[PDB]
Amino acid sequence: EDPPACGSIVPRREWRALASECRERLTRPVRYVVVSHTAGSHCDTPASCAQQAQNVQSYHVRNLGWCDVGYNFLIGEDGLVYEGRGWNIKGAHAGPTWNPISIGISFMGNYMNRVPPPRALRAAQNLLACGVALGALRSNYEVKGHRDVQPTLSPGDRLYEIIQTWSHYRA
Amino acid sequence: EDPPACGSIVPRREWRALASECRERLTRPVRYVVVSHTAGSHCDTPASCAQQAQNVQSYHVRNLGWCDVGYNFLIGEDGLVYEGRGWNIKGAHAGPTWNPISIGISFMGNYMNRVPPPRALRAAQNLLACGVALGALRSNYEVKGHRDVQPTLSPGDRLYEIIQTWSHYRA
Amino acid sequence: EDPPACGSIVPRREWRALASECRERLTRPVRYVVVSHTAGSHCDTPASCAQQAQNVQSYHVRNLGWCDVGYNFLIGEDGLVYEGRGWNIKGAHAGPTWNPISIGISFMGNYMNRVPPPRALRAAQNLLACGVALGALRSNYEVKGHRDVQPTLSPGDRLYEIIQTWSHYRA
Amino acid sequence: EDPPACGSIVPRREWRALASECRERLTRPVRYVVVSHTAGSHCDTPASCAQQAQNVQSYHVRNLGWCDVGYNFLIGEDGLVYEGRGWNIKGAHAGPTWNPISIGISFMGNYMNRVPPPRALRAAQNLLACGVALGALRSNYEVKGHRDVQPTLSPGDRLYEIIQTWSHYRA
Ligand SMILES: O=C(O)C1=C[C@H](O)[C@@H](OS(=O)(=O)O)[C@H](O[C@H]2[C@H](O)[C@@H](NS(=O)(=O)O)[C@@H](O)O[C@@H]2COS(=O)(=O)O)O1
């Protein structure tokens, strides 16, 4: 809807993503953002992190039979944003009540005992700012933790504490 | 304190920069943008690249007497943007004529025979977009090649042919 | 397992209300009840009151970009109780400290110089009785006036006057 | 041409405010100004208005039990600005989405059918020019009407109507 093409996202073709088979859309503008962690291995290079975003799309498509990597976006400790289902497609990351009404972004790693570095954190916020800018998210969007909407450890205590300090965070 | 800088810029402090001692101020919103390469080693991980930003600054300050690292902004092959002098302070990257009326961004590496990764080209443009938003660049701003305004090879034949392809490029 | 058919409430479907997008829950039995007035135009018939509810919701949803009309229930001067966020969804009518521990019912009208007609008042008391039979409210719930918890003229002076006399009212 | 240069404000002691006790801080520079009116009575003498101030504060501190008057600044029709919570302390005047990112200013009176006089209008636009000079407010800050972000008639049709003409009004 709006002119400013936004942030910096590693496109699907760049991290070598299997093609999506997903077709259902979200109604723009979206009101909620659920933050999670892959609880998998972390990476801190554009190289390892492309691999990673690939291993995760993989486990989701090849092992759980999803139409594509479950999150709308992933975040690398290389401080880069990875492209998933994107802004317009419904994701599979927070159960049936929430998947139809939110954008799910997952930090690649397990933040039970680690805080993601500032660049990781920075990517995520810009991403959200971009979402608003784009008209994808409501200007007064709300950020929820995974655990606030499903029973789980995600996004990890550390990262959990951190997103609780964010201006759009509503528990 | 509030959301970070659009463009996800690595702050002076995060790459361990020496404090700047420059005072001369630019008049945001600026009209020109000049692209150059450091002609130093390239780096491609957040680690490698912080050290390189540190390196180039140490050079400019410890050795060329400069008040701060010359450039307004530096770009790494890790695809991150490194804060240099910023939006407000006159740089030292294109001489008397151009240092006061343009913002200088520099790609870390020699790009005479290497093209830099697309993620670098991305942080660059997104860098500029976020320049109008925060309002440091004039919306209709123009891009010039370091060699388009000084007797220099920089930014290298490869980078240079690309920035030529650009939209808000010029002359 | 004792069910009363105490619900003489007009469902949203019946007043042609837009779908709510709220998901935050109230934990019953709720201890507090806050009374406000729209401060807007009042209605005296089931058909215009349905229209008025629509309006109140439109303002909160389109104008203030809220997930749904802020009150749990609305009382029309037509003597009917209009369903808002209902008994189990945290309203948005008295701030961060009261919203999550109270039911916010609001009288559709401006009561700074009118008293609501007896039937509107009967409607409200019976609504509360209802909520007690269901267990949604504590049998010993406390009623506050809007101005008692936030700076507002709400619920209007003559209405404020009346609820102060009420059995469940509390300092 | 030299530092300390803007707007006259009646300080707390001068009007006998109760010692504030609020600790939470706004982050400067602030982007939003939310305009409200007290919804009570006006005043037009340094004597009455300073009395006015106290009352308002009494309600918010005695009655609502808050840590200090809700607004950051009040305008009296006496033509003076009464120090509210200052440029640095989060106030309670517009709900939790805006309290942490706005400066809230309230005209002391009710402006539904009545408009405030040239001088209150001047004290207010002087306070803002001053907020900008101090870097308490962003240079390109935005002004909202209270009713634009909360359900309320505040700031009154006549006043609301007026601020809409304002240079920094953002619908
Ligand atoms: O712009 C707003 O005024 C506004 C934005 C949203 O619709 C909503 O939440 S948000 O910024 O998190 O998106 C918000 O509702 C608030 C409400 O303002 C608060 N009290 S109130 O002002 O009296 O209404 C409080 O209850 O928090 C609400 C959010 O609650 S939550 O979504 O259940 O977490 O209004």
| Residue in C closest to A148 by C-alpha | C24
Work out the angle at residue B122's Cα, subtended by the Cα atoms of residues B120 and B126, and round it to the nearest 5 degrees: 125
D138 DSSP assignment: E
3-state secondary structure of A152: coil
The residue type at C68: D
- Distances from the Cα of B9 to the Cα of A83, B5, B29, B46, B74, angstroms: 20, 6, 19, 12, 10
CA distance C15 to B166: 55
- The Cα–Cα gap between C135 and C141 comes to 11
Q: D16: which 2 tokens?
A: 């006998």
Determine contact: C96 vs chain A, CB below 8 A. Answer: no
Contact assessment for residue B107 and residue B71, using Cβ atoms and an 8 Å cutoff: no
Cross-chain Cβ contact C60/D153 below 8 Å: no
Give CA A20 to chain center in angstroms. 16
Q: Is the CB of B1 inside 8 Å of chain D's CB atoms?
A: yes
**A12-45 b/e (C-beta count within 10 Å ≥ 16 → b):** bebbebeebebeeebeebbbbbbbbbbbeebbbb
Count of C-beta atoms within a 10 Å radius of residue D97: 17
Residue appearing with tokens 């961004």: B105
DSSP C101: G
Instruction: Using alpha carbons only, give the angle D134, D140, D145 rounded to the nearest 5 degrees.
Output: 100
The torsion angles phi and psi of C75, rounded to 5 degrees, stand at -110, 120
Closest residue, chain D, to B133 (C-alpha): D140
Ligand 1 center to D94 CA (angstroms): 11
Indicate the pairing of strand C81-83 with strand C73-75. antiparallel
From the list C84, C102, C86, C89, the residue with the least C-alpha distance to C30 is: C102
Place of tokens 């600026």: B30
Which amino acid, one-letter code, is at D94?
A
The amino acid at A77: E
Please answer yes or no on whether A7 and B8 come within 8 Å at the CB atom: yes
Cβ atoms of B18 and B70 within 8 Å: the answer is no
Cα C9 from chain centroid (whole Å): 11
User: Across the interface, do B5 and A123 touch by the CB < 8 Å criterion?
Assistant: no
Ligand 1 atom 7: residue of nearest CA: C66
Query: Chains touching chain A at 3 or more Cβ pairs under 8 angstroms?
Result: B, C, D
Cα angle for residues B158, B162, B168 (degrees, 5° grid)? 150
Question: Which ranges of D20-144 does DSSP label H, i.e. alpha helix?
Answer: 46-58, 95-98, 118-133
DSSP per residue over chain B, as a string?
--S--TT-EEPTGGGTPPPP----B--SSEEEEEEEE--S----SHHHHHHHHHHHHHIIIIIT--SS-S-SEEE-TTS-EEESSTTTB--SSSHHHHTTTEEEEEESS--SS-PPPHHHHHHHHHHHHHHHHTT-EEEEEEEEEGGGSSS--TT-HHHHHHHHH-SS---
Q: Which residue matches tokens 């009176």?
A: D109
Q: What is the number of H-type helices and E-type strands within chain C?
A: 4, 6
Residue type, A94: A
Inspect the interface and report whether the beta carbons of B79 and A46 lie closer than 8 Å: yes
Domains of chain D, first to last: 1-171 (3.40.80.10)
- What is the spatial order of strands in the sheet that B102-107 belongs to? B9-10, B81-83, B73-75, B102-107, B30-37, B137-145
* Distance to chain B for A11, nearest Cα, Å: 10
Is D101's Cβ below 8 Å from some Cβ in A? yes
* Ligand 1, atom nearest to D149 Cα: 3
Give Cβ neighbours of residue D65 (< 8 Å, ≥ 6 apart). Answer: none
- Residue D95 tokens read as 């709900």
Which chain A residue is nearest to residue B121, measuring alpha carbons?
Answer: A8
Resolution in Å, one decimal place: 2.8
Which residues does chain A have within 8 Å of residue D27's beta carbon, measured at their own beta carbons? none
Substitution candidate for ligand 1 out of C27, C57, C63, C66 with most atoms within 8 A of CB: C66
Q: Which amino acid is at C139?
A: S
- The ligand 1 atom nearest the CA atom of D150: 3
- β D73-75/D9-10 pair status: unpaired
Does D152 contact C at CB distance below 8 Å? yes
B:D CB pairs within 8 Å? 4
Q: Which two tokens stand for residue C165?
A: 């006399």
Region of residue D53 (left: phi > 0; alpha: psi -120 to 50; beta: else): alpha
DSSP H or E stretch at residue A157: helix A157-163
Q: How many CB atoms within 10 Å of residue C58?
A: 13
Residues in D touching A167 (Cβ below 8 Å): 100-101
Render A101-116 in DSSP notation, one character per residue.
GEEEEEESS-TTS-PP
Beta strands in chain A (DSSP E): 9-10, 30-37, 73-75, 81-83, 102-107, 137-145
- Identify which of A32, A128, A142 to mutate to test ligand 1's pocket (most ligand atoms within 8 A of the CB): A142
The CA distance from A28 to B86, in Å, is 35
CB of A167 less than 8 A from some CB of D: yes
Q: Find the discontinuities in chain A where C to next N exceeds 2.5 angstroms and give the residue preceding each.
A: none
Contact B4 A80 (CB under 8 A): no
CA distance A69 to chain D (A): 33
Are the beta carbons of B2 and D27 separated by less than 8 Å? yes
Q: Which of A7, A12, A13 is nearest to A128 (CA)?
A: A7
CB contact under 8 A, D27 and B135: no
Contact A139 C21 (CB under 8 A): no
Closest CA to A108 of A140, A145, A71: A71
Q: Which residues in C lie closer than 8 A to residue D151 (C-beta atoms)?
A: 59-60, 64, 70
What one-character DSSP code corresponds to residue C15? G
Structure tokens at C157: 């002076």
* Beta strand ranges found along D19-127 (DSSP E): 30-37, 73-75, 81-83, 102-107
Residue C139: enclosing H or E segment and its boundaries? Answer: strand C137-145
Walk across the sheet containing A81-83 and list its strands.
Answer: A9-10, A81-83, A73-75, A102-107, A30-37, A137-145
